Design a protein around this ligand. Structure first.
Ligand SMILES: *[C@@H]1O[C@H](CO)[C@@H](O[C@@H]2O[C@H](CO)[C@@H](O[C@@H]3O[C@H](CO[C@H]4O[C@H](CO)[C@@H](O)[C@H](O)[C@@H]4O)[C@@H](O)[C@H](O[C@H]4O[C@H](CO)[C@@H](O)[C@H](O)[C@@H]4O)[C@@H]3O)[C@H](O)[C@H]2NC(C)=O)[C@H](O)[C@H]1NC(C)=O
Ligand SMILES: *[C@@H]1O[C@H](CO)[C@@H](O[C@@H]2O[C@H](CO)[C@@H](O[C@@H]3O[C@H](CO)[C@@H](O)[C@H](O)[C@@H]3O)[C@H](O)[C@H]2NC(C)=O)[C@H](O)[C@H]1NC(C)=O
Ligand SMILES: *[C@@H]1O[C@H](CO)[C@@H](O[C@@H]2O[C@H](CO)[C@@H](O[C@@H]3O[C@H](CO)[C@@H](O)[C@H](O)[C@@H]3O)[C@H](O)[C@H]2NC(C)=O)[C@H](O)[C@H]1NC(C)=O
Ligand SMILES: *[C@@H]1O[C@H](CO)[C@@H](O[C@@H]2O[C@H](CO)[C@@H](O)[C@H](O)[C@H]2NC(C)=O)[C@H](O)[C@H]1NC(C)=O
Ligand SMILES: *[C@@H]1O[C@H](CO)[C@@H](O[C@@H]2O[C@H](CO)[C@@H](O)[C@H](O)[C@H]2NC(C)=O)[C@H](O)[C@H]1NC(C)=O
Ligand SMILES: *[C@@H]1O[C@H](CO)[C@@H](O)[C@H](O)[C@H]1NC(C)=O
Ligand SMILES: *[C@@H]1O[C@H](CO)[C@@H](O)[C@H](O)[C@H]1NC(C)=O
Ligand SMILES: *[C@H]1O[C@H](CO)[C@H](O)[C@H](O)[C@H]1NC(C)=O
Ligand SMILES: [Ca+2]
Ligand SMILES: [Ca+2]
Ligand SMILES: [Ca+2]
Ligand SMILES: [Ca+2]
Ligand SMILES: [Ca+2]
Ligand SMILES: [Ca+2]
Ligand SMILES: [Ca+2]
Ligand SMILES: [Ca+2]
Ligand SMILES: [Ca+2]
Ligand SMILES: [Ca+2]
Lengths: 142, 70, 70, 141, 71, 142
């Protein structure tokens, strides 16, 4: 809820953009003291982000508050083993299913390299001409 | 240069050197730092640190089995 | 590709069912060169075990006969 | 539970392995030095003809020895320091002459050079050369 | 019928006297009162007291069952 | 497609809508046959709700996060089941920190239950004879 009693999505609060038309969401006093709700990391800028976006490599808070390199470069932020895929250049850990999905997930095209070698599921997959795997429910779907 | 999980290029002189060079301990993970010992698995005897000697060398008064481990 | 003594004894196999369709072959030094109809190729490998297989050229028409001029 | 003291190789006319012997929990078995075969009597050893049995052990002409073999090289080849590979000596380097439909082609044996000897033939299915007169023969089927 | 096994309801026949939600307490050995999404839970010595607190843009029912939006 | 919860006898008669308001994206439900309650989850409000079976007296009984660290949070809650014998609600979540949560049937004593080797836990159930929990994962495929 804002000052003028119009209430907005909690993600837009202190997002550097005036939404409540009274600049209550971008007031420095509130944007400093406020605490991000459970599960979200807080930036020094006052923005709230999901905790999964710390060490995301990409900037989230605008001030690079979400990328402490020293912390992100230790063992404390390793990839989830046997469930996530690690990039080859950056320190990003991406969900494994994002490998070979027709999008640059690792930001250096690591996830989309050597796509011709990954085997599709023996029963529940359809193999594309560009060696992608799609769920069989999407063939002939239109 | 072996590529650490966090993107550090480390020379192969430091892989499994019992020192965390990468900063995350990826270089010294157990995937490369197991180095299994001689199992001596089929059709021979085994004594001490993996001496896969033939069965005739069991307790035959000939100290070949490390420090006479049999 | 098989070779044997001049009396047809002691046969040995170089390639074992790996060849589409050889038609001609020649040996020089330790290398055997053969012409393959199905891939339309000239290619070579070691004359005793077939190691180091290399496709020398992609002919558009069937290569029929081959010889080493030396 | 027969012969459980292992030792059964340790006599002359009994066991009678002519090269070497090893004993199991119960009894002996015979063995030969390298390059000898256990023969079907299970007592005795024989020299293999390594030249006839395994010609791939020599790059060229092979000579049998009792207990081993020696690799020679045919006239015009030099034996490499490794003792197995023979290398052609004449400075005349070889090339592959091969025939296609409409073409006879001259290919160098590493794939680096690829040229044309003749073109506009009907169908060249066979081909051969003559060293003495530097001639070339073929069949236009 | 076995995929919902029969067992004795702890709120049985009374809702434990709670005017609102009689829920099963954790461990499944006793009950516990509660209040709807826009009431204030107030505890007395022996009886829970849930009373409406709905907004200006919400309408409260005459017998205080619930609150509904003004529209 | 209509954002409603209906009910009907099994002889196809007396079809009736019981909930139609303030229900954004209801992901799953289960029926407390014992104290007569309907429990459901929604992915947008990221909450666990409860009602009388007739739709009156709604309440929210879990929100924000599970655990004392906020490591596991309602993000994409999905399958739900009850174990009224022991007064527990179990539910799956397939967010970034995918997990299986548990809470008392009156909103106390919330906990994580499964937090490792779990990516896409769509399904959850209980075998009431063995008292064994079961789930399935759509990514790891187990
Ligand atoms: C393409 O390549 C071909 C073949 O390599 C060349 O043809 C050769 O040309 C040479 C000349 O450059 C020819 O040499 C001459 O051959 C005559 C005939 O010899 C025949 O009979 C003898 C005896 O039985 C055989 O040994 C021989 O093989 C032949 O069957 C000789 O009589 C000639 O000798 C005369 O001239 C020489 C000087 O040149 C004198 O010393 C002699 O006393 C004598 O007067 C001569 O040797 C050779 O025959 C051709 N090849 C063959 C084998 O037939 C083409 O020239 C070449 N083309 C090009 C353009 O390069
Ligand atoms: C397999 O059989 C051979 C032949 O029987 C065994 O070779 C034996 O090896 C020993 C040690 O090398 C030989 O003794 C040595 O002989 C030389 C003279 O040649 C002498 O100068 C040394 O002081 C020493 O005594 C022995 O002569 C030889 N056997 C015979 C009878 O010639 C070999 O050891 C056997 N291997 C196994 C695994 O059983
Ligand atoms: C789902 O499908 C099953 C199987 O087709 C249905 O079971 C059927 O239920 C009806 C109603 O109870 C049964 O008919 C009744 O049978 C009893 C006993 O013979 C009789 O006394 C009644 O007069 C009536 O004929 C039917 O036999 C039964 N069939 C089977 C194979 O079980 C079930 O009703 C279906 N459920 C729904 C919600 O559609
Ligand atoms: C919840 O948070 C605390 C920190 O406040 C965690 O305790 C630390 O855990 C790490 C390993 O995960 C250790 O290296 C630290 O030394 C611990 N610090 C302290 C003060 O104990 C705790 O592990 C977290 N709980 C769970 C279940 O993950
Ligand atoms: C609240 O949750 C905790 C777990 O987070 C429960 O503790 C477990 O309870 C079972 C059954 O009583 C024990 O067998 C386990 O050893 C307990 N584990 C831990 C880590 O506490 C606890 O029982 C729950 N409380 C209620 C009210 O049911
Ligand atoms: C990690 O993943 C590997 C497979 O890449 C697996 O063998 C191993 O058991 C997993 N566990 C850990 C943390 O080593
Ligand atoms: C032969 O053709 C293939 C394509 O079919 C090509 O990739 C290859 O490079 C060719 N061989 C050589 C010697 O270039
Ligand atoms: C932030 O944390 C504080 C406690 O320090 C309060 O719980 C506050 O309510 C939290 N923020 C929000 C958005 O609820
Ligand atoms: Ca804002
Ligand atoms: Ca970031
Ligand atoms: Ca991708
Ligand atoms: Ca499609
Ligand atoms: Ca190291
Ligand atoms: Ca010994
Ligand atoms: Ca010999
Ligand atoms: Ca959500
Ligand atoms: Ca995850
Ligand atoms: Ca899948």
């Amino acid at each position: 809820q804002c000052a003028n009693k119009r209430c907005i999505p909690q993600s837009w609060q202190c997002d550097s953009v005036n939404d409540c038309l009274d600049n209550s969401d971008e007031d420095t006093s509130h944007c400093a003291s406020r605490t991000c709700r459970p599960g979200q990391f807080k930036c020094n800028n006052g923005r709230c982000i999901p905790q999964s976006w710390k060490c995301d490599v990409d900037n989230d808070c605008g001030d690079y508050s979400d990328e402490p390199i020293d912390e992100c470069t230790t063992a404390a932020y390793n990839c989830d083993n046997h469930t996530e895929f690690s990039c080859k250049t950056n320190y990003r850990c991406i969900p494994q299913w994002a490998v070979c999905n027709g999008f640059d997930d690792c930001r250096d095209n690591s996830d989309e390299q050597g796509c011709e070698s990954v085997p599709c599921h023996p029963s529940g997959d359809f193999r594309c001409a560009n060696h992608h795997c799609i769920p069989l429910r999407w063939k002939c779907d239109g | 240069q072996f590529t650490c999980q966090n993107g550090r290029c480390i020379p192969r002189f430091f892989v499994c050197d019992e020192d965390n060079d990468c900063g995350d301990g990826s270089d010294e993970q157990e995937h490369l730092c197991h180095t299994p010992e001689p199992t001596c698995p089929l059709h021979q005897f085994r004594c001490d640190n993996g001496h896969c000697i033939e069965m005739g060398r069991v307790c035959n008064h000939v100290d070949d089995c490390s420090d006479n481990s049999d | 590709i098989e070779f044997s003594d001049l009396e047809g004894h002691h046969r040995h196999t170089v390639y074992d069912g790996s060849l589409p369709h050889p038609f001609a072959l020649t040996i020089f030094e330790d290398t055997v060169f053969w012409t393959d109809w199905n891939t339309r190729t000239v290619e070579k490998g070691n004359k005793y075990d077939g190691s180091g297989r290399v496709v020398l050229v992609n002919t558009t028409h069937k290569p029929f006969d081959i010889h080493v001029y030396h | 539970e027969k012969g459980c003291g292992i030792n059964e190789c340790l006599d002359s006319s009994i066991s009678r392995c002519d090269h070497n012997c090893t004993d199991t929990i119960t009894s002996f078995y015979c063995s030969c030095l390298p390059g000898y075969k256990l023969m079907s009597d299970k007592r005795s050893c024989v020299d293999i003809d390594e030249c006839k049995e395994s010609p791939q052990l020599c790059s060229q002409k092979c000579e049998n020895v009792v207990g081993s073999y020696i690799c020679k090289c045919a006239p015009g080849y030099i034996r490499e320091p490794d003792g197995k590979s023979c290398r052609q000596n004449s400075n005349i380097e070889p090339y592959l002459i091969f025939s296609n439909r409409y073409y006879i082609r001259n290919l160098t044996t590493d794939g680096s050079s690829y040229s044309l000897i003749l073109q506009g033939l009907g169908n060249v299915v066979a081909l051969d050369f003559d060293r003495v007169e530097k001639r070339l023969y073929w069949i236009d089927a | 019928p076995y995929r919902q096994p029969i067992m004795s309801n702890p709120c049985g026949t009374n809702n434990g006297g709670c005017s609102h939600l009689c829920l099963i307490k954790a461990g499944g050995r006793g009950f516990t009162c509660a209040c709807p999404d826009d009431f204030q839970t107030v505890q007395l010595r022996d009886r829970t007291l849930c009373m409406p607190m709905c907004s200006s843009t919400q309408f409260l029912c005459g017998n205080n069952e619930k609150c509904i939006p003004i529209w | 497609e209509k954002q409603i919860i209906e009910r009907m006898f099994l002889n196809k008669t007396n079809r009736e809508t019981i909930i139609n308001h303030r229900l954004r994206r209801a992901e799953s439900l289960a029926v407390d046959w014992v104290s007569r309650k309907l429990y459901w989850l929604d992915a947008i409000l990221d909450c666990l709700f409860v009602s009388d079976l007739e739709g009156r007296h709604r309440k929210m009984i879990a929100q924000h996060c599970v655990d004392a660290n906020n490591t596991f949070c309602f993000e994409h809650p999905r399958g739900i089941v009850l174990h009224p014998q022991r007064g527990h609600v179990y539910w799956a979540d397939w967010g970034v920190h995918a997990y299986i949560g548990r809470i008392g049937m009156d909103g106390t004593n919330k906990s994580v239950i499964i937090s490792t080797k779990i990516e896409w836990p769509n399904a959850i159930t209980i075998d009431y004879t063995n008292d064994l929990l079961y789930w399935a994962d759509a990514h790891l495929g187990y």
